[PDB]
Amino acid sequence: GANKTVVVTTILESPYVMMKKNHEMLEGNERYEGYCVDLAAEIAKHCGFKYKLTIVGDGKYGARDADTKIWNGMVGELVYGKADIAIAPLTITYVREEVIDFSKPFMSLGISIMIKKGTPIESAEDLSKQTEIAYGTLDSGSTKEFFRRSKIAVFDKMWTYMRSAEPSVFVRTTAEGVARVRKSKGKYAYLLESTMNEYIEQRKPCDTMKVGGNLDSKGYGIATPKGSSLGNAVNLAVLKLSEQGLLDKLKNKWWYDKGECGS
Amino acid sequence: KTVVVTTILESPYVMMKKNHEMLEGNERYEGYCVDLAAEIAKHCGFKYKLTIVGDGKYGARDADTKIWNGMVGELVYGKADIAIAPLTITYVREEVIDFSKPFMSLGISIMIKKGTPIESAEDLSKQTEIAYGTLDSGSTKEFFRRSKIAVFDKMWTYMRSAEPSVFVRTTAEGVARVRKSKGKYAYLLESTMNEYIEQRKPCDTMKVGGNLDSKGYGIATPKGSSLGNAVNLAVLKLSEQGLLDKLKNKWWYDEC
Ligand SMILES: CCN1CNS(=O)(=O)c2cnccc21
Ligand SMILES: CCN1CNS(=O)(=O)c2cnccc21
Ligand SMILES: N[C@@H](CCC(=O)O)C(=O)O
Ligand SMILES: N[C@@H](CCC(=O)O)C(=O)O
Ligand SMILES: [Cl-]
Ligand SMILES: [Cl-]
């Protein structure tokens, strides 16, 4: 049929998608800025479609309820036909690839540790061997599923602690995890993707840091419903933008050019 | 029936075993990609035959004839069913073959003989005493040829017309040339192979600077192959189980 506006699901996650300072008087895509906003514009230009950015209603990345088998978050938006494409820091995973399609990765990341500066923690093994410093992850995301599923001894030990910790060590948004690190006087460490860790490390008040190596190695992909006619073009678009150096330029723009913690 | 796997002799991905002359079939070979092939085939449930690519090339399309050579050509022209190798995911290749999600990350990197006064690609571009080049018929050469990025464009203009040729036929020859040119040759190659060589005797090379780009190796299949979906899920499964990390540790295991 005639061309239709593509519905893009995304999530309010800095610096991927952020409200512009004057958003209260703006409409449509103009309300937003950030890495994924710029990426969405590039992808759409290369694939030749118009689009509408829509923030996912439940503010979640996407997990499958064990009871009802219903997908929530952005994955759910794609699975149930509420969006045509997800352009967001959405991690490529086995269980998601079973139900949606992913482009080749546009950004690499690994699970990493965020501490308040001066916290006596250097590694995941460090965390697993003590109890004074609590630690947790985001809900409904790939990091929590990583620990839940891991058969690796250290990570399994961490999961058995996290799943039963009281009060809950899990948070609903990345921002909540960051606040919890900043406010807990070194007694909370946050497990999150290295991309978000490195971003926060450059924001005032510059009181956090990433420690140790990454726990795994993965990537974000642009996601489409299985069998979507958009998948092929979007995939080539990602590889073209990568080859041209544009993805590198966008990361520099949003992570480091705008960094608040010096040169 | 039996899946024909095209691969290439490239340490530590695929190597001839000691006394391979008395061995046969898949048993002749060892390495990261040999182990990976075994895991993939187990998860997908097929039997396979490892075969070394006839022309010993990764794959490039000839400008005139528009014929693909190397492992890419073997997939394009139906000589193999799947490629399991350090085969780089690129735009131009994705137009003619399919790739799994990446099983290993890499970037183009600089190898120098230790003590060479080079810190970066920018450094290389702005001098002429030290010659530099890349592998033939591979993604690295194609990257520089295609690049509009100013430093890389400048490097390409020099490399394409340098005499004698700065290009080499195999990775081993690039490394040998670095080691024998007394610091007057730098080799542009993927960080994976750079890091591997860095840890092997005579310990006289090193990787300098950051990587020039960021990409990955994928398992490749002909377009519309029945194997694509299962292979892709198998890679992600192996990744999440931590086995790709274990295999990297094994074959890049630490001479220096
Ligand atoms: C090589 C590690 N790995 C596993 N396969 S993936 O999850 O598609 C991925 C994506 N991006 C970078 C790395 C990466
Ligand atoms: C994020 C960079 N990037 C470009 N897209 S790719 O070439 O499919 C790839 C593969 N592996 C890691 C990274 C990677
Ligand atoms: N990128 C993750 C969310 C962040 C996290 O889980 O740490 C996902 O797609 O689920
Ligand atoms: N991995 C490369 C070969 C090595 C190189 O080009 O440096 C390819 O697939 O072409
Ligand atoms: Cl419309
Ligand atoms: Cl430039």
Curated annotation (Swiss-Prot), chain B:
Primary location: membrane
Keyword Signal: yes
Phosphoserine found at: 147, 181
Single annotated GO MF: kainate selective glutamate receptor activity
Post-translational modification: Palmitoylated. Depalmitoylated upon L-glutamate stimulation. Ubiquitinated by RNF167, leading to its degradation.
Site (Interaction with the cone snail toxin Con-ikot-ikot): residue numbering on this chain: 61, 145, 237
Free-text domain note: The M4 transmembrane segment mediates tetramerization and is required for cell surface expression.
Note in the entry: The postsynaptic actions of L-glutamate are mediated by a variety of receptors that are named according to their selective agonists. This receptor binds AMPA (quisqualate) > L-glutamate > kainate.
Described function: Ionotropic glutamate receptor that functions as a ligand-gated cation channel, gated by L-glutamate and glutamatergic agonists such as alpha-amino-3-hydroxy-5-methyl-4-isoxazolepropionic acid (AMPA), quisqualic acid, and kainic acid. L-glutamate acts as an excitatory neurotransmitter at many synapses in the central nervous system and plays an important role in fast excitatory synaptic transmission.
Name of the molecule in the record: Glutamate receptor 2
The organism of origin for this protein: Rattus norvegicus (Rat)
Gene: Gria2
Residues of the full protein shown: 414 to 794 of 883
